Design a protein around this ligand. Structure first.
Ligand SMILES: CN1CN([C@@H]2O[C@H](COP(=O)(O)OP(=O)(O)OP(=O)(O)O)[C@@H](O)[C@H]2O)c2nc(N)[nH]c(=O)c21
Length: 171
């Protein structure tokens, strides 16, 4: 239907544009050697995504971020959107990136649930994530360019992530 409330994953705002995922509770052995109970989504899905000023298209499958296209925006929003999408995608690389205990409390003194532990952890320790994520030679394409961990156009890109330029197509 035309009017749809957006879904939210902390700071990440999302709207699904294709696919049909199904959620199954699974036990996941993550990178710090602990087992986490997580509702894992299965199926190829694409989302419209946004964090602050940065907007993009996220394509995922089960525990895999396939492709992330985003616009150029303020670097903190670009970086946060990428991290939130890596976490949202439940990518195995993301799970494997965790070190030490994820036992963060909220302001009501309760433990965050596992997905929110992960969002909180990687937002504030992104080098853990990006190291595990992998880098590849940037795509050489006309309207797309890769980005590095500093959110700059580079010869090498975070794997699966692509940025568009702000171009005056209509003059
Ligand atoms: C990883 N997610 C998370 N998610 C949805 O994104 C929102 C934020 O996830 P969440 O806060 O972990 O949801 P949760 O607390 O598990 O509640 P729910 O029972 O709705 O899943 C929720 O609306 C959740 O349903 C998703 N929706 C789809 N279609 N595919 C997905 O892979 C995912």
């Amino acid at each position: 239907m035309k009017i749809r409330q957006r879904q939210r994953f902390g700071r990440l705002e999302l709207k699904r544009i294709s696919g049909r995922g199904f959620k199954n509770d699974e036990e996941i052995l993550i990178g710090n050697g602990t087992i986490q109970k997580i509702g894992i989504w299965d199926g190829e899905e694409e989302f419209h995504v946004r964090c602050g000023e940065c907007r993009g298209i996220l394509k995922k499958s089960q525990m895999r971020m396939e492709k992330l296209l985003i616009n150029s925006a303020k670097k903190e929003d670009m970086k946060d959107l990428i991290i939130l999408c890596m976490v949202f995608s439940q990518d195995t690389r993301m799970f494997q990136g965790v070190r030490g205990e994820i036992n963060f409390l909220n302001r009501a003194g309760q433990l965050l649930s596992p997905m929110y532990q992960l969002q909180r952890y990687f937002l504030n320790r992104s080098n853990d994530l990006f190291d595990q994520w992998g880098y590849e030679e940037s795509p050489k394409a006309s309207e797309l360019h890769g980005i590095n961990e500093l959110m700059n156009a580079s010869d090498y890109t975070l794997k699966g992530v692509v940025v568009t330029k702000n171009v005056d197509h209509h003059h």
